[PDB]
């Protein structure tokens, strides 16, 4: 979950 949050932020 920590490891997947940055991908989500970069998409916003």
């Amino acid at each position, epitope marked *: *979950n*920590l*490891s*997947e*949050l*940055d*991908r989500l*932020l970069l998409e*916003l």
Partner: antibody
Amino acid sequence: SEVQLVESGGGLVQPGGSLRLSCAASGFNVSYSSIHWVRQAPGKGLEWVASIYSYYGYTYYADSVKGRFTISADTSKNTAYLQMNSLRAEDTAVYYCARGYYGAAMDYWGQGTLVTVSS
Amino acid sequence: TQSPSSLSASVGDRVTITCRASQSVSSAVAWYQQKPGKAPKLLIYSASSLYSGVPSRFSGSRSGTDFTLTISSLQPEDFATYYCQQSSSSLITFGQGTKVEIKR
């Protein structure tokens, strides 16, 4: 606007003492990014300390600092902080701030600041 | 093993570093270069993706549980210390790291 991270604070603190490091960001919005603290004891490897994801309100900590250190962010000042309490000798290290990228990879880094814990 | 391993190499040599961050198959893995008195520089992310601006001689690879960084031809500026990073769902771990020194 060029991306960078400027660290402030640090220095000498006695065991059991408290100290706050600052990480002022520019070129990007801290509220839509992740900030990470990583430290390095003299002649030793990199050690992850803490991470913050302001947008989601998630914070994570290494077991070695859990309950003693607190990571936080001030959106209005575009700055992240590491509050270090109950310091011990083995916390002596150069402390880096860094911005997160895919997979918590760290693309931009601060200049580092030395924290010495000793009597 | 709290301090980085040492490796002696010559300019033009091929070097492959294996990650020891006690990682898993799920892990998102990154690689860094650090020189004395300087902050680390990102080389690889997501196991095998080359970060923007990083020379193509650096490559990352994943084989099961084993994560690897290869420098296909060592250049003078490549002599430095290298670390892998493994990110789990709630934790980041940096590996021991390898310090590449010049053979002479």
